[PDB]
Amino acid sequence: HICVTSKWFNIDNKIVDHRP
Amino acid sequence: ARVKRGVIARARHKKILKQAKGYYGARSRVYRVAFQAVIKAGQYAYRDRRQRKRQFRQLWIARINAAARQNGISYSKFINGLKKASVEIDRKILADIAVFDKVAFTALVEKAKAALA
Amino acid sequence: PKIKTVRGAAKRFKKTGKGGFKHKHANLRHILTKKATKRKRHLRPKAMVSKGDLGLVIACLPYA
Amino acid sequence: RLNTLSPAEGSKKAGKRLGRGIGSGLGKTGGRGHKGQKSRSGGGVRRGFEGGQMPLYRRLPKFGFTSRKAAITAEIRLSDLAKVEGGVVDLNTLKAANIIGIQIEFAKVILAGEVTTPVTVRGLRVTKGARAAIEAAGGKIEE
Amino acid sequence: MELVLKDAQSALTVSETTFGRDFNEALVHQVVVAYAAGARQGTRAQKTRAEVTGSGKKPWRQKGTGRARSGSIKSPIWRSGGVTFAARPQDHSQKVNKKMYRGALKSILSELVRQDRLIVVEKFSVEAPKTKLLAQKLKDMALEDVLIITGELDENLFLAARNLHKVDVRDATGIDPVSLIAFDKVVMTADAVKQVEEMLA
RNA sequence: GCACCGAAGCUGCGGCAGCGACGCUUAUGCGUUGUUGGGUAGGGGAGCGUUCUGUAAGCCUGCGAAGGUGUGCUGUGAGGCA
RNA sequence: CGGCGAGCGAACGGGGAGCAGCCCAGAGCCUGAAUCAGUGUGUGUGUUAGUGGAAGCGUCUGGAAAGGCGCGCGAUACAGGGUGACAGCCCCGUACACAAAAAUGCACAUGCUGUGAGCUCGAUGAGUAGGGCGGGACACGUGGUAUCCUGUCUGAAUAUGGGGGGACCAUCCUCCAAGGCUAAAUACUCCUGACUGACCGAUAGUGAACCAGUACCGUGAGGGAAAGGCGAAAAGAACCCCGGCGAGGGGAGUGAAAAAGAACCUGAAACCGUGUACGUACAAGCAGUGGGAGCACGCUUAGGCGUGUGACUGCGUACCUUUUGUAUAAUGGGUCAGCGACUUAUAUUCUGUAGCAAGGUUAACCGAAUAGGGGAGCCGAAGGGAAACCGAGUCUUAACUGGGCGUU
Numbered sequence A: 001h002i003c004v005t006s007k008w009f010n011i012d013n014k015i016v017d018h019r020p
Numbered sequence B: 001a002r003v004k005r006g007v008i009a010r011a012r013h014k015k016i017l018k019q020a021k022g023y024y025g026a027r028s029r030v031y032r033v034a035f036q037a038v039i040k041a042g043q044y045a046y047r048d049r050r051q052r053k054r055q056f057r058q059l060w061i062a063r064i065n066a067a068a069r070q071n072g073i074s075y076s077k078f079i080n081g082l083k084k085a086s087v088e089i090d091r092k093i094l095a096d097i098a099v100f101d102k103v104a105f106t107a108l109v110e111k112a113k114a115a116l117a
Numbered sequence C: 001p002k003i004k005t006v007r008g009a010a011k012r013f014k015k016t017g018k019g020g021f022k023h024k025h026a027n028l029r030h031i032l033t034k035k036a037t038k039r040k041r042h043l044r045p046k047a048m049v050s051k052g053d054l055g056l057v058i059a060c061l062p063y064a
Numbered sequence D: 001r002l003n004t005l006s007p008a009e010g011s012k013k014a015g016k017r018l019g020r021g022i023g024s025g026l027g028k029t030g031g032r033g034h035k036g037q038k039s040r041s042g043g044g045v046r047r048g049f050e051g052g053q054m055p056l057y058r059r060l061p062k063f064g065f066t067s068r069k070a071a072i073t074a075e076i077r078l079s080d081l082a083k084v085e086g087g088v089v090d091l092n093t094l095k096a097a098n099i100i101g102i103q104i105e106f107a108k109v110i111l112a113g114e115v116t117t118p119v120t121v122r123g124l125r126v127t128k129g130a131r132a133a134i135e136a137a138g139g140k141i142e143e
Numbered sequence E: 001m002e003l004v005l006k007d008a009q010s011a012l013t014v015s016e017t018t019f020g021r022d023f024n025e026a027l028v029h030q031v032v033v034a035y036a037a038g039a040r041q042g043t044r045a046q047k048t049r050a051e052v053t054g055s056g057k058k059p060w061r062q063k064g065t066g067r068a069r070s071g072s073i074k075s076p077i078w079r080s081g082g083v084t085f086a087a088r089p090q091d092h093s094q095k096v097n098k099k100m101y102r103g104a105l106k107s108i109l110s111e112l113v114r115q116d117r118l119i120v121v122e123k124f125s126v127e128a129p130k131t132k133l134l135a136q137k138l139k140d141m142a143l144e145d146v147l148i149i150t151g152e153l154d155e156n157l158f159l160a161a162r163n164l165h166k167v168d169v170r171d172a173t174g175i176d177p178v179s180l181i182a183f184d185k186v187v188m189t190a191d192a193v194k195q196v197e198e199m200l201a
Numbered sequence F: 001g002c003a004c005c006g007a008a009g010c011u012g013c014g015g016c017a018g019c020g021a022c023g024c025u026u027a028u029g030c031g032u033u034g035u036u037g038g039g040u041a042g043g044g045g046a047g048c049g050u051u052c053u054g055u056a057a058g059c060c061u062g063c064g065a066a067g068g069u070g071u072g073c074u075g076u077g078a079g080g081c082a
Numbered sequence G: 001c002g003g004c005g006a007g008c009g010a011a012c013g014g015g016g017a018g019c020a021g022c023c024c025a026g027a028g029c030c031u032g033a034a035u036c037a038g039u040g041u042g043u044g045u046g047u048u049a050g051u052g053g054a055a056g057c058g059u060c061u062g063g064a065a066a067g068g069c070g071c072g073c074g075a076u077a078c079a080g081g082g083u084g085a086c087a088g089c090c091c092c093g094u095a096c097a098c099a100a101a102a103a104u105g106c107a108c109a110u111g112c113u114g115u116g117a118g119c120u121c122g123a124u125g126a127g128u129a130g131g132g133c134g135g136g137a138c139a140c141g142u143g144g145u146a147u148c149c150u151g152u153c154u155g156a157a158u159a160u161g162g163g164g165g166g167a168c169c170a171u172c173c174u175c176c177a178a179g180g181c182u183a184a185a186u187a188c189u190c191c192u193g194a195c196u197g198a199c200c201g202a203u204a205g206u207g208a209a210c211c212a213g214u215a216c217c218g219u220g221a222g223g224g225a226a227a228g229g230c231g232a233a234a235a236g237a238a239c240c241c242c243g244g245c246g247a248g249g250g251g252a253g254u255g256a257a258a259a260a261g262a263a264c265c266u267g268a269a270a271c272c273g274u275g276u277a278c279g280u281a282c283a284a285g286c287a288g289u290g291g292g293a294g295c296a297c298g299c300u301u302a303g304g305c306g307u308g309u310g311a312c313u314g315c316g317u318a319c320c321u322u323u324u325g326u327a328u329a330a331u332g333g334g335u336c337a338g339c340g341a342c343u344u345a346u347a348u349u350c351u352g353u354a355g356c357a358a359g360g361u362u363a364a365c366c367g368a369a370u371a372g373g374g375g376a377g378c379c380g381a382a383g384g385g386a387a388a389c390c391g392a393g394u395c396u397u398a399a400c401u402g403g404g405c406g407u408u
């Protein structure tokens, strides 16, 4: 199809720092 | 010389799926899953060829025992009899006769009792 | 390409007759005055590389 | 008959392939073992290296000195000379019989056994045992 | 070693060492194989990752995307473009010692007699450059598959047989190992025999 | 104190393979017979099949090749034959 | 040569390919005389269209013969492609023999232009050689460092002269710098022609077998796809029926085949349904395995037999990896299919095997081209010593009763 464009981000984003 | 591959491949694969026939879901559909199912079936078998001889012996010994008790004597004494019954040797399966020929059995019990007297 | 001899080793071993290697002893190049004459004396004549190091030396001198 | 020839038995060893399955004997790891520098593409350590320890070919002292004169001296066996072609074994001549090599400028004769045909050797040096063998075979040794 | 001269029964007399010697299978097998190699040309394709067509840009971030590592779009693991150990044009020529080559021919001749597949003749030549002629000579001689090593080689004998498929004609020097074995019968003029006699010493 | 249950240990019956010896018999293979055969890293040995060259202007093939899908048989297996 | 590390790495001499030698630094006479290029013509020879080019029929199977079988025929032609399946004789070719009106590459031969030849007598490359300082080149890292180049400052001799012979000096030997030209053996392939492959066959092979550097992405540089096959022949489905003058479908007809109908050769696997047999709504877990009734189906003549299902039942925590150890609640995998990892070259050593043997073998190159020639050379037959040197010994020491390495 024409149908062919994927610009998948970076992870997605929000949160996490999980105690250091 | 480039090698096509892949005709021999599905040969290997189908060789396995065929062995998986009957298994549930992926175990019979999906090679990656089937190749495992096929192996472990093999593993159990190899094991259970040895188990079979165990399971039946205790099957035999179980019913040898009731019949012995039925003729008023425990399995313990009863094998000891036949042992001591002037040598004499006779399979625990062949004590099959306990189910199909009960006089022959009782008859065997007596012969055993006598040696124990 | 031809192997290159590990040039440093070339300057410290010489293939002998039966295929051995012979070398100069260490410990005889300076700070001598405090060493027994007996010791220094025994360190003059060359000596064969031991069985354990043969492996090394040969790999260093393919064209020995 | 062009499909009835076959090579001598044990002249064509198959040769490790490795990396092809459990049965092969050299699957998975391919006889390289588990981890470390020696596995891994382009692994290994250079010759002479023996961990960071000072290597044998460095603990031991140099003792060279290359003669350079030696490089142009040949040695001659008694077994030669018969093959010199002309009964005169000369400064070169041997050279022409391809038993010395052009660049050579010196030569001893060495008791390396077996001389028969009488021969006169000229301009060479010759050991005590070689002289004796030459002479005892009707040979002559003029300088 | 005498050889029945076929037509004008005469006997030729040949060297026992070059015509009566034991068949050394291995030794011939090395030379025939060797000859079959070196028939080869190199001429070969395949682009290592160094020579597939694309930029050297990293397809996507080391870490972060949920993706496998990925480094070069020309990677053999990836699809289009790869070939881990791409071949190059190469030379399959083997050596074969002088004395081993000769050693093989002798084992081969000295086996062709032993199966009388070698029939030696005083003179062999066709009267005109016409295939049909040669076809007939062979017919009369009871032959289809033949090597026919002529003494000095002539125009007409060559142009005939150029088109007969199972038959070739070579001069004395043109003798190669596969051919001796290739054809069902090797003819050879008694004149050629003497040439070969010496060539092999 | 005498039974008996209980393991892939021991024994029994059949079979394979390596190394032995002894007898039949030696471009060996039989018959015994004693013995050995868990196995990762790894070393050694022997093989199956795939692509391509010769052998091959041969051989198979429209009275049905390759491939696909079943089925029977066969080998210790990779497999093979139909 | 070298933090004498890692590494770098000659020359002398030898075997081969190809070979070729000339001008200026100048004036006199004789003068345009050799020669070179540029150019016109001629000729020959290649090129850019072309021409001729042998010989097969019968029958069987088939939709179709080139196939099988039979009997002929050409072959200096059995290279190859095509044709309804595999064709020497159907077609196009092939071998072979021929052809150029014109334009051209290449050789010669000359015409025109430009150019100098020849003899006599001369001349013989100075801000250079060398040196100092700084670097750079030489295999050579300043090292005892010759030699070459020069940014910088200097600066000769001139044939009775000068350079080099690896610091340096003598002797000897050998060459003539500070001006140039010069063909071949050598390198390369955007492109033209012909031929070849133990090279790939549509995820392979060019990124591209296809209207691909396209569609697409990017402000731009720039990145960069997917996607081949109906049939022998379109004979590509007239006409009829349902339907919205639809989509899609069923007939009809073409064809060997329509299950080859264009979403078209083969048509696997994941994945999703319809149909039938058997099991399943009191039962707990890697889902199988050993046992095992019933049912459906075939058997056999029964005979606890084949196939399918599998109540009930003994045992039973997947795979990989990584680990002292993993059901592990530690890694990796949603599934299938295709692809995806110990190669190649050159050295060196060991084993096997082959040849020959105190010898073995050639490299380039020649080539009647896997032959034959070529033994330059390499390995071995002698070792010991840093070395001179000695030699079945030698080194150690004044010397070994010795000792080290060697002699089998």
Ligand SMILES: N[C@@H](Cc1c[nH]c2ccccc12)C(=O)O
Residues within 6 Å of the ligand: A010, A011, A012, A013, A014, A015, A016
């Ligand atoms: N939530 C993010 C983690 C994260 C935190 N900060 C971010 C910034 C950018 C991208 C991702 C993150 C994840 O799923 O991984």
Ligand SMILES: N[C@@H](Cc1c[nH]c2ccccc12)C(=O)O
Residues within 6 Å of the ligand: A014, A015, A016, A017, A018
């Ligand atoms: N670590 C904090 C804040 C936070 C959210 N996203 C982050 C990304 C990066 C660093 C910190 C954060 C939390 O998770 O509550």
Ligand SMILES: [Mg+2]
Residues within 6 Å of the ligand: B053, B054
């Ligand atoms: Mg048991």
Ligand SMILES: [Mg+2]
Residues within 6 Å of the ligand: C028, C029, C030
């Ligand atoms: Mg000192």
Ligand SMILES: [Mg+2]
Residues within 6 Å of the ligand: D029, D034, D035
């Ligand atoms: Mg690993």
Ligand SMILES: [Mg+2]
Residues within 6 Å of the ligand: D034, D035, D036
């Ligand atoms: Mg480790």
Ligand SMILES: [Mg+2]
Residues within 6 Å of the ligand: D032, D033, D034, D035, D036, D038, D039
């Ligand atoms: Mg390791």
Ligand SMILES: [Mg+2]
Residues within 6 Å of the ligand: D098, D099, D101, D102
């Ligand atoms: Mg020589």
Ligand SMILES: [Mg+2]
Residues within 6 Å of the ligand: E055, E056, E057
């Ligand atoms: Mg890059």
Ligand SMILES: [Mg+2]
Residues within 6 Å of the ligand: E066, E067, E068
């Ligand atoms: Mg993922």
Ligand SMILES: [Mg+2]
Residues within 6 Å of the ligand: E047, E080, E081, E082
């Ligand atoms: Mg590719």
Ligand SMILES: [Mg+2]
Residues within 6 Å of the ligand: none
């Ligand atoms: Mg040769």
Ligand SMILES: [Mg+2]
Residues within 6 Å of the ligand: F038
């Ligand atoms: Mg085991």
Ligand SMILES: [Mg+2]
Residues within 6 Å of the ligand: none
């Ligand atoms: Mg195939």
Ligand SMILES: [Mg+2]
Residues within 6 Å of the ligand: none
């Ligand atoms: Mg024509």
Ligand SMILES: [Mg+2]
Residues within 6 Å of the ligand: none
């Ligand atoms: Mg024709």
